[PDB]
Amino acid sequence: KRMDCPALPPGWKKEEVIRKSGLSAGKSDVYYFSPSGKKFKSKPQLARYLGNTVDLSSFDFRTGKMMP
DNA sequence: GCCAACGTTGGC
DNA sequence: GCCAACGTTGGC
């Protein structure tokens, strides 16, 4: 399920997906979805898209919070 | 050719 | 030793 991420612009959602198989089974990946539904796999990728819209320097990609 | 899913490693 | 970040690839 895609959760709302209030630290990002309206419409932004975070999803955490448990790996199901392989040696990394049990681990999890985090994704964000833009208001238009585009998928983001890393903080630099978000940064390049959001630019000056928000400062992501204090942003924890995994938890989706601003942690200073 | 695409991309979801897992593998992989450099930087800490 | 962990994990953020991105590379690889099997299945479609």
UniProtKB/Swiss-Prot annotation:
Q: Where in the cell is it found?
A: Nucleus; Chromosome
Where are residues bearing Phosphoserine located in the sequence? 34
Could you tell me which residue ranges the MBD domain spans? Answer: 1-66
Task: Give the domain of life.
Answer: Eukaryota
User: Which positions carry the signal peptide feature in this UniProt record?
Assistant: none
Distribution of this protein across tissues and organs? Highly expressed in brain, heart, kidney, stomach, testis and placenta.
| Function recorded in the entry | Binds CpG islands in promoters where the DNA is methylated at position 5 of cytosine within CpG dinucleotides. Binds hemimethylated DNA as well. Recruits histone deacetylases and DNA methyltransferases to chromatin. Acts as a component of the histone deacetylase NuRD complex which participates in the remodeling of chromatin. Acts as a transcriptional repressor and plays a role in gene silencing. Functions as a scaffold protein, targeting GATAD2A and GATAD2B to chromatin to promote repression. May enhance the activation of some unmethylated cAMP-responsive promoters.
Oligomeric state and interaction partners are given as: Heterodimer with MBD3 (via N-terminus). Component of the MeCP1 complex that contains HDAC1 and HDAC2. Component of the nucleosome remodeling and deacetylase (NuRD) repressor complex, composed of core proteins MTA1, MTA2, MTA3, RBBP4, RBBP7, HDAC1, HDAC2, MBD2, MBD3, and peripherally associated proteins CDK2AP1, CDK2AP2, GATAD2A, GATAD2B, CHD3, CHD4 and CHD5. The exact stoichiometry of the NuRD complex is unknown, and some subunits such as MBD2 and MBD3, GATAD2A and GATAD2B, and CHD3, CHD4 and CHD5 define mutually exclusive NuRD complexes. Interacts with CDK2AP1. Interacts with DHX9.
Name assigned to this protein: Methyl-CpG-binding domain protein 2
Record organism = Homo sapiens
List the range of the whole protein covered here: 148 to 215 of 411
